[PDB]
């Protein structure tokens, strides 16, 4: 049953790509002040779950949902900017830059590991196809 | 044909009174392999087109799977031909 | 066109370049008395918006206007 490794590692690659994309989106908007609806940008993060249907022992990984990060919104005193609060408290995203950079590095490394898994699995499948010949 | 439809109704009458194969399996396997290869190729062309939602990960993995399936078909053909040559070599 | 990560990071680079340009133009005109018409120079600000192409999921940064 080496074919299931294709599904497992492909799901892992897709999930890590989504995680890296979300981390990069958070990082690129660390300095944002406004959203499309006027709301401040809220740092977002993916949720990882075991991609196993009920009764399946072990599977790959899947992104359940994207959730707003739990952290206080960064308050900035700029009661001159057109966007402000009642007391001039501009709300800026709660992005922790170090966390996002480490997340990007971790996602890249896990991605590369899954690529190696896929490569060696394909090599083994070819060798198995050359069983008796 | 008119006579062909006559034959169809005749076979239906035959079924009334009365009341898949190796070549078929090989044809099914070839169709499955070709369909997988065409699906991978179409997804690759869609990605090269720039259409949203198609990820490079899926393209590359599907190309990998299509290559493995093609190699499986090649091996099956090789053996099958070898077995046919062995059978035809039998002296009667 | 661009891959999603490429677009996001390139938009971030362009937005930061625009903000740096606004800051440099303000720092140059710190002592200007008049413009080309006879009105004082007004400090420019750049507003970052999130270019959420999908619904609330992700997106780079765009600049609506200065």
């Amino acid at each position: 049953a080496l074919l299931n490794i294709f599904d497992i590692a492909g799901s892992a690659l897709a999930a890590q790509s989504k995680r890296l994309n979300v981390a990069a989106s958070n990082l690129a908007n660390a300095d944002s002040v406004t959203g499309p609806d006027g709301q401040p940008y809220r740092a977002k993060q993916v949720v990882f779950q075991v991609d196993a249907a009920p009764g399946q022992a072990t599977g790959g990984v899947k992104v359940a949902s994207v959730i707003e990060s739990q952290a206080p919104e960064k308050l900035v005193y700029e009661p001159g900017n057109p966007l402000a609060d009642a007391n001039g408290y501009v709300k800026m995203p709660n992005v922790d830059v170090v966390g996002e950079m480490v997340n990007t590095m971790s996602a890249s490394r896990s991605y590369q590991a899954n690529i190696e898994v896929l490569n060696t699995v394909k090599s083994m499948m070819l060798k198995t196809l050359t069983l008796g010949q | 044909a008119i006579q062909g439809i006559e034959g169809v109704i005749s076979q239906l009458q035959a079924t009334a009174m009365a009341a898949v194969s190796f070549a078929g399996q090989l044809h099914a396997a070839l169709d499955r392999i070709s369909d997988r290869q065409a699906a991978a190729r179409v997804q690759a062309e869609k990605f090269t087109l720039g259409e949203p939602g198609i990820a490079l990960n899926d393209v590359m993995a599907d190309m990998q799977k299509a290559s493995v399936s093609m190699q499986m078909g090649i091996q099956v053909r090789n053996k099958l031909v070898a077995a046919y040559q062995e059978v035809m070599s039998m002296q009667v | 066109a661009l891959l999603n990560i490429f677009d996001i990071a390139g938009s971030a680079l362009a937005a930061q370049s625009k903000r740096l340009n606004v800051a440099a133009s303000n720092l140059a005109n710190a002592d200007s008395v008049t413009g080309p018409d006879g009105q004082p120079y007004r400090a420019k600000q750049v507003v970052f918006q999130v270019d959420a192409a999908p619904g609330q999921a992700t997106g780079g940064v765009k600049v609506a206007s200065v």
Binding site: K18 | E51, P52 | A57
Partner: peptide, 13 residues
């Protein structure tokens, strides 16, 4: 689904 992958073509078409 809701989130497109990093290695996907710009969601904006």
């Amino acid at each position: 689904g809701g989130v497109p992958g990093a290695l996907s073509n710009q969601p904006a078409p």
